[PDB]
Design a protein around this ligand. Structure first.
Ligand SMILES: *[C@@H]1O[C@H](CO)[C@@H](O[C@@H]2O[C@H](CO)[C@@H](O)[C@H](O)[C@H]2NC(C)=O)[C@H](O)[C@H]1NC(C)=O
Ligand SMILES: *[C@@H]1O[C@H](CO)[C@@H](O[C@@H]2O[C@H](CO)[C@@H](O)[C@H](O)[C@H]2NC(C)=O)[C@H](O)[C@H]1NC(C)=O
Ligand SMILES: *[C@@H]1O[C@H](CO)[C@@H](O[C@@H]2O[C@H](CO)[C@@H](O)[C@H](O)[C@H]2NC(C)=O)[C@H](O)[C@H]1NC(C)=O
Ligand SMILES: *[C@@H]1O[C@H](CO)[C@@H](O[C@@H]2O[C@H](CO)[C@@H](O)[C@H](O)[C@H]2NC(C)=O)[C@H](O)[C@H]1NC(C)=O
Ligand SMILES: *[C@@H]1O[C@H](CO)[C@@H](O[C@@H]2O[C@H](CO)[C@@H](O)[C@H](O)[C@H]2NC(C)=O)[C@H](O)[C@H]1NC(C)=O
Ligand SMILES: *[C@@H]1O[C@H](CO)[C@@H](O)[C@H](O)[C@H]1NC(C)=O
Ligand SMILES: *[C@@H]1O[C@H](CO)[C@@H](O)[C@H](O)[C@H]1NC(C)=O
Lengths: 50, 50, 170, 49, 99
């Protein structure tokens, strides 16, 4: 299929109307960020030659 | 087949056409003794960083 | 297509697998970059058919209906100004869908301000939104309202100068 | 797939190490990939090559 | 930068070779249409909101904070005066209460 960018949302714009929230949601989201790698050391002489 | 490693008694059961066993790096990690047909693991001697 | 060459190349191991894996990682990283830049909204916002924004003109940045590519005149000028085992993979997002993403972002920031980036898109008149932005930089709303025609004229002149500067500088 | 970002880093590091150890099994055009086989099979003038 | 929505706070959590941030954000919800005006014309003077916005439920005009509906009577304590009513485009007529 051709991938849908998203749902269409026609904002009801006019020159004298505003939308004010009457309520709220306390939303908790996760963000995972890598920090470090495995500290690997390779003996070059021992790797090549044993 | 020459090498250097600790020889220990092995739990692997070789088929009668098999003489040696290879690891990921194609080093002999298991070997059959040609006089008494028993299997030995060959763990390498300890390596450290000074 | 040489079989002897590939038989000798197998003696070197998995170098080719490493290079193909690195190029595949680069190729998917480009699509990840385009997703991270342009696909920040899950709603495709559209401008109203009547472009009454209190004197503010966005025709140089809104998509042109007469063009089949649905690009803005500025975006059309930007696209005009940029000119043995190798393959070029096409990007996951084509240029019209990237233009549609930018059009959705433009419609959201014009009709709703910064509200669509923090939740549901809340409609607001554009002079009032501009007044809010004026208060963000520490200038009172009255200054914006009193000099609104001048601000809209300056904004339209600057947008036209942007198009002229892009069309006149190689 | 919640923690996929850490798992990709771990998998890439383990895969790089695994490919590094797989590279020891290649002879690179020599007669064998084992140094001990070359030291036991050849005189030093060809063994140096 | 710190989650989707208006950022309130965040909590760090350790992870194997990584960090997990629990971003606590404020998301607006249950929005309602209102009729809005840039300024209020009273006694030949233009009144502008000090921190909020003028809203109307259909018959009466109020001033509320921008991110939450909390209508209050338009007074001289939450508005400021700048100029007359002839300059601001879209100014509407409404009374301004004096405490
Ligand atoms: C604010 O009013 C507008 C129009 O007065 C509403 O937009 C309409 O919403 C309905 C239901 O989704 C649609 O069928 C109409 O086509 C919309 N009209 C327009 C012009 O967009 C809008 O939903 C109202 N907002 C709220 C929060 O009630
Ligand atoms: C604002 O939204 C909250 C939910 O996020 C509403 O709280 C719910 O109200 C209904 C009806 O009173 C209850 O059945 C639910 O149990 C409530 N949920 C929670 C988590 O308390 C709240 O009523 C809304 N307030 C307004 C003014 O709209
Ligand atoms: C917004 O700007 C566009 C262009 O900046 C205006 O379109 C011009 O209109 C005049 C008069 O009709 C024409 O002579 C030009 O050829 C038009 N230019 C282009 C590029 O189309 C437009 O009138 C402005 N106003 C509105 C409300 O759209
Ligand atoms: C707009 O809000 C005002 C104030 O909240 C409403 O005025 C009140 O309406 C109730 C219900 O009829 C009356 O009991 C009160 O006496 C009214 N107060 C005043 C000071 O008039 C008004 O009805 C609301 N309008 C709409 C269309 O919802
Ligand atoms: C808002 O109030 C002003 C002033 O009270 C109104 O302006 C008057 O309009 C009438 C008829 O249009 C004229 O006869 C007066 O001379 C005007 N006075 C001034 C000082 O301009 C204005 O019409 C009102 N607007 C609305 C929508 O009611
Ligand atoms: C000699 O080697 C054979 C294997 O070829 C084995 O069966 C036998 O036990 C060995 N005898 C001695 C005395 O080592
Ligand atoms: C809003 O537009 C209508 C026409 O659609 C016009 O009558 C009215 O004066 C405009 N108001 C403002 C504040 O521009």
């Amino acid at each position: 299929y051709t991938m849908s960018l998203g749902a269409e949302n026609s904002v009801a714009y006019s020159n004298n109307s505003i939308a004010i929230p009457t309520n709220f949601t306390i939303s908790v989201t996760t963000e995972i960020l890598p920090v470090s790698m495995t500290k690997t050391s390779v003996d070059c002489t021992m790797y090549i030659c044993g | 087949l020459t090498g250097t490693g600790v020889l220990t008694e092995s739990n692997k059961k070789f088929l009668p056409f098999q003489q040696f066993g290879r690891d990921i790096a194609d080093t002999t990690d298991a070997v059959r003794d040609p006089q008494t047909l028993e299997i030995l693991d060959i763990t390498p001697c300890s390596f450290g960083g000074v | 297509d040489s079989t002897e060459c590939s038989n000798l190349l197998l003696q070197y191991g998995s170098f080719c697998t490493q290079l193909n894996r690195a190029l595949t990682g680069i190729a998917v990283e480009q699509d990840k970059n385009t997703q991270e830049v342009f696909a920040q909204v899950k709603q495709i916002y559209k401008t109203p058919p009547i472009k009454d924004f209190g004197g503010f003109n966005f025709s140089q940045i809104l998509p042109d209906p007469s063009k089949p590519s649905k690009r803005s005149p500025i975006e059309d000028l930007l696209f005009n100004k940029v000119t043995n085992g190798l393959t070029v993979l096409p990007p996951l997002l084509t240029d019209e869908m990237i233009a549609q993403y930018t059009s959705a972002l433009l419609a959201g920031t014009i009709t709703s301000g910064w509200t669509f980036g923090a939740g549901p898109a809340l409609q607001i008149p554009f002079p009032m939104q501009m007044a809010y932005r004026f208060n963000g930089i520490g200038v009172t709303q009255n200054v914006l309202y009193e000099n609104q025609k001048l601000i809209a004229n300056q904004f339209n002149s600057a947008i036209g100068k942007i198009q002229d500067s892009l069309s006149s500088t190689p | 797939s919640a923690l996929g970002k850490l798992q990709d880093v771990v998998n890439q590091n383990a895969q790089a190490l695994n490919t590094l150890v797989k590279q020891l099994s290649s002879n690179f055009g020599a007669i064998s990939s084992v140094l001990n086989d070359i030291l036991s099979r050849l005189d030093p003038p060809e063994a140096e090559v | 930068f710190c989650g989707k929505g208006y950022h309130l706070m965040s909590f760090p959590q350790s992870a194997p070779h990584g960090v997990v941030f629990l971003h606590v954000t404020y998301v607006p919800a249950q929005e309602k249409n209102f009729t809005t005006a840039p300024a209020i014309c009273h006694d030949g003077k233009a009144h502008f909101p000090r921190e909020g916005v003028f809203v109307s439920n259909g018959t009466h005009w109020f001033v509320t904070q921008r991110n939450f509906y909390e209508p209050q009577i338009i007074t001289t304590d939450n508005t400021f005066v700048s100029g007359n009513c002839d300059v601001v485009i879209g100014i509407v007529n409404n009374t301004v209460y004096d405490p």
